[PDB]
Amino acid sequence: SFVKSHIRPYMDEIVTLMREFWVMNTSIQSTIILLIEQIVVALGGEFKLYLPQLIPHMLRVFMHDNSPGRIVSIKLLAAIQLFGANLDDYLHLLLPPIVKLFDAPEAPLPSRKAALETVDRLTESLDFTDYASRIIHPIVRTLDQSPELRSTAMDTLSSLVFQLGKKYQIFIPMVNKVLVRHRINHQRYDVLICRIVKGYTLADEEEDPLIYQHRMLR
Amino acid sequence: RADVELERILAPYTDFHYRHSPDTAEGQLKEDREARFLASKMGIIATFRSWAGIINLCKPGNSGIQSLIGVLCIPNMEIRRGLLEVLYDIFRLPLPVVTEEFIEALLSVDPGRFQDSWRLSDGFVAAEAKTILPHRARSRPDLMDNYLALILSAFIRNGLLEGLVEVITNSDDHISVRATILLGELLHMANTILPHSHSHHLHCLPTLMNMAASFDIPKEKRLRASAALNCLKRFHEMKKRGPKPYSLHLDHIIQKAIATHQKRDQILKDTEEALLINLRDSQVLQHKENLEWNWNLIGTILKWPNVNLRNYKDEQLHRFVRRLLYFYKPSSKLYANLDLDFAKAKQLTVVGCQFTEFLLESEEDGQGYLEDLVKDIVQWLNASSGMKPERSLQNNGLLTTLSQHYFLFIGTLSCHPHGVKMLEKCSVFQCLLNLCSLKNQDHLLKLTVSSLDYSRDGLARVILSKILTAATDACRLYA
Numbered sequence A: 001s002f003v004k005s006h007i008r009p010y011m012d013e014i015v016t017l018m019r020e021f022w023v024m025n026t027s028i029q030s031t032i033i034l035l036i037e038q039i040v041v042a043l044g045g046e047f048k049l050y051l052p053q054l055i056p057h058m059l060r061v062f063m064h065d066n067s068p069g070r071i072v073s074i075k076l077l078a079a080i081q082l083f084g085a086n087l088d089d090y091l092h093l094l095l096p097p098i099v100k101l102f103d104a105p106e107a108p109l110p111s112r113k114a115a116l117e118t119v120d121r122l123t124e125s126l127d128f129t130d131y132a133s134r135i136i137h138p139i140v141r142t143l144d145q146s147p148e149l150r151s152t153a154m155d156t157l158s159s160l161v162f163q164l165g166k167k168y169q170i171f172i173p174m175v176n177k178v179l180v181r182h183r184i185n186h187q188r189y190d191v192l193i194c195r196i197v198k199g200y201t202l203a204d205e206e207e208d209p210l211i212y213q214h215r216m217l218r
Numbered sequence B: 001r002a003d004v005e006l007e008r009i010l011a012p013y014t015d016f017h018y019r020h021s022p023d024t025a026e027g028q029l030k031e032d033r034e035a036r037f038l039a040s041k042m043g044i045i046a047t048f049r050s051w052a053g054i055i056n057l058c059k060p061g062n063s064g065i066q067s068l069i070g071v072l073c074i075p076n077m078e079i080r081r082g083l084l085e086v087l088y089d090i091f092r093l094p095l096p097v098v099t100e101e102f103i104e105a106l107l108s109v110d111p112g113r114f115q116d117s118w119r120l121s122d123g124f125v126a127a128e129a130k131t132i133l134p135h136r137a138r139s140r141p142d143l144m145d146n147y148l149a150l151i152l153s154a155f156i157r158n159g160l161l162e163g164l165v166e167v168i169t170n171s172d173d174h175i176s177v178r179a180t181i182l183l184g185e186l187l188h189m190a191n192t193i194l195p196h197s198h199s200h201h202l203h204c205l206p207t208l209m210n211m212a213a214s215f216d217i218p219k220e221k222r223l224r225a226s227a228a229l230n231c232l233k234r235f236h237e238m239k240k241r242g243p244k245p246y247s248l249h250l251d252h253i254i255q256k257a258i259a260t261h262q263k264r265d266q267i268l269k270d271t272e273e274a275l276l277i278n279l280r281d282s283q284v285l286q287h288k289e290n291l292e293w294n295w296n297l298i299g300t301i302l303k304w305p306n307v308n309l310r311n312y313k314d315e316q317l318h319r320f321v322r323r324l325l326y327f328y329k330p331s332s333k334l335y336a337n338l339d340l341d342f343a344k345a346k347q348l349t350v351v352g353c354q355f356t357e358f359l360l361e362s363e364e365d366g367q368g369y370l371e372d373l374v375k376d377i378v379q380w381l382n383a384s385s386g387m388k389p390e391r392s393l394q395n396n397g398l399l400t401t402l403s404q405h406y407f408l409f410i411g412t413l414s415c416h417p418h419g420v421k422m423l424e425k426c427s428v429f430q431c432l433l434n435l436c437s438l439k440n441q442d443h444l445l446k447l448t449v450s451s452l453d454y455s456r457d458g459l460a461r462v463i464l465s466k467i468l469t470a471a472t473d474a475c476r477l478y479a
């Protein structure tokens, strides 16, 4: 936390120390996760060099978790929301474990909420256009068998269809069945689909989301 | 002589410590270097436009084009950043901005970026349509493509792509972004102007993919190679997107043309509950303070399929419509006073257009409001054109405020068949016929010639013909 980016010449060995004492189910993960968060805040952009070595363990935490209420999964999810644009080349083997977390009907409800919210918040720095079919269907499955995860799943869906332009117009009749079956009203999803079906402009539809994020950051 | 006379002009780049004059003032040593760089660039990009220079610089021997690529593969951040400008202006490509992030320099090379020629005073719509809309020729030779293909083949033969990859990986970020953009532009030009045999193995990029997939090299090179591949894919997506209408008149023109082409050859209900909820959260009826309304909700309550003031006879909806009408009227001096470059200026215009079309969607219940709005617009236009003796000069407000978008409302109103009837009920077409005659205001003719619709025969073509035959020479030229 004190040396921001000068820890690089001694960072690799640090990872070598974390891969040795990160056993699966003990009280040592609660501090390893905080160490990961602090390393992420320190490196800030160069973390992608040392992210792969910590990817297996994370996966073994997502499936082999026997914590009361799945609180280690929640801490790991809150630690993942800090990665930002670092998990750009590694979103392919780290997203499926999270999409498998909120569509499982036996997982605790707060863990599913945490997964939905981290998927919702990870779209403010990443391009989620390619991984559209892997997210649209688990969400419409979470919407018809979970009467309490409706609002958070709708927020995630609205944040996802904001990046997709007219590329989402093919899914509208598929989601509308579930939306009218349970009388699901969301005010931002209605806005987005109204601007998708009926045109708003021509330059605003089918736009790179990173371009929009950059032009709104300035 | 063979290899010592003509190849001198590229000595400032190939020689890292180049001294042109034996005795020069020691005070000016960097300005002299920049002048040498500029002159050598102007000579190098001038020998590649002639055949006697192309052939003599790309000879199969120890030519002067291989010495130009070889010094590009040397980590010298002064020669390497100056050779990229020569490569950029050799292929007639636009230069990106000097940044370190790819997503900011990719936006500066957008074929549809705003230009100074597209302003109302300069080139309002005709100059803008030239850039974004493509030429009508699909089989003309276009000798420029021939020349560019020859130059690109000559450069690829001597190993330019490998040098660009080496510049992309082993260099700074300021130069990595510019080399990635140049590589993307060259890869796009390849699959467009090169024959299939010349460009069927270029998209593999072996030297970059073998680096992005090798786990023996240091991890920094692998990660920057993967990032370069991702940026190349992003550039390809940007290229296959296309240029989009920057302005709001050309947008409506293209949309109307596409709609005509679609309809020449062949959703939620929200009965009473969701309509009222969306009308409530919009905040229009809670308070009448403008600029604090929720304009997204207004747009979606105006654009929803079956909400047309003709099947939902609710007093709250009529209050909503009357408040929006009083806001949009120019006499109220509420919308017509906001200046251009406003924070939310395009959205207000889009909402106004879809609102004056929603009023038209009710052919039996939307007269009292639409007639009032268009009559107020005609009043404002006759006052600002010079048909009154008060001032007869109001160009200081039309050119700098959102009151110039009242031509877009008449434009989106003249497309529909029931729209032109309402437009003729009031003295709109006669007003434009009278406006065509004046000589002092030329911007109003630009505005009225690029807003109306000429799809069907009627009074809309008579105004166009009157401007084309009897008008000011500059207005006639723009028409």
Ligand SMILES: Nc1ncnc2c1ncn2[C@@H]1O[C@H](COP(=O)(O)OP(=O)(O)OP(O)(O)=S)[C@@H](O)[C@H]1O
Pocket (backbone or CB within 6 Å): B288, B289, B290, B318, B319, B320, B322, B323, B324, B326, B327, B334
């Ligand atoms: N900035 C404004 N935007 C909209 N309306 C305004 C604005 N400023 C004043 N008004 C007044 O509000 C009127 C529209 O309100 P109405 O449609 O009559 O609904 P209303 O709630 O009955 O209005 P009042 O004031 O209560 S009678 C405008 O025509 C003006 O009389």
